[PDB]
């Protein structure tokens, strides 16, 4: 694609969340770059409104699959980097087990040189002693997901699924079920792709020289499931 030629180098990356959860209203700004060649991503992300209500670990998904590595013989199946510049909408709904859920939306596009992933986050139902309001999921994220891609010709888009696992404080895990669709903003032509998926490894870390509420990730994400 066209798209996958704005790639080829590190591209700096921002993102801004608004959040609402059981009506606690937050926000989140992130900076930091991908490099879609070794499917690499460097993110710091600070809480600059109200005291965060939810674990950050929880945010991780929500807060740029375009800088998956897609192998040389599967990049004709790579949406995410075919819908861009003009970019795509990426919707989920993750559902926390014996808790509440998320619905997200956010668009994905450049602003200029900068790859900008602007969200909206709306969460209900949770439990007040529950282990997100609770906070009791600890700060790590000591499982890898697979992301399940299917294509949505029908919305000239994919779909997706998978499964993320947090680490709860007593040793046990919190499931995150989560259903995403993404389309595209513009109107130049996209990839459709055959089912595969990206193989997400993330981990969180803190700047000891940081006071504000805030989370450093590092993430490598690899298109994987076809020979
Ligand atoms: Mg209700």
Not at 53 to 80: A, E, G, I, N
Not at 98 to 121: M, P, Q
Not at 134 to 160: F, M, P
Request: glycine content about 8%; proline content about 4%; aromatic content about 10%.
């Amino acid at each position: 694609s066209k798209g996958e030629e704005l790639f080829t180098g590190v591209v700096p990356i921002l993102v801004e969340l608004d959040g609402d959860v059981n009506g606690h209203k937050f926000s989140v700004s992130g900076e930091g770059e991908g490099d879609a060649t070794y499917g690499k991503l460097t993110l710091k992300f600070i809480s600059t409104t109200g005291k965060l209500p939810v674990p950050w670990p929880t945010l991780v998904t929500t807060l740029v699959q375009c800088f998956s590595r897609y192998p040389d013989h599967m990049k004709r199946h790579d949406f995410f980097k075919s819908a861009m510049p003009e970019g795509y909408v990426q919707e989920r709904t993750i559902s926390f087990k014996d808790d509440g859920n998320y619905k997200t939306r956010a668009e994905v596009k450049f602003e200029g040189d900068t790859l900008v992933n602007r969200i909206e986050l709306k969460g209900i139902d949770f439990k007040e002693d529950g282990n997100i309001l609770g906070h009791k999921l600890e700060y790590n994220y000591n499982c890898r997901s697979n992301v399940y891609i299917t294509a949505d010709k029908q919305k000239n888009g994919i779909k997706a699924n998978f499964k993320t696992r947090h680490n709860i404080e007593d040793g046990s895990v919190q499931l995150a079920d989560h259903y995403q669709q993404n389309t595209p903003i513009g109107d130049g032509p996209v990839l459709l792709p055959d089912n595969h998926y990206l193989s997400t490894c993330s981990a969180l870390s803190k700047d000891p020289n940081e006071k504000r509420d805030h989370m450093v990730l590092l993430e490598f994400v690899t298109a994987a499931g076809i020979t």
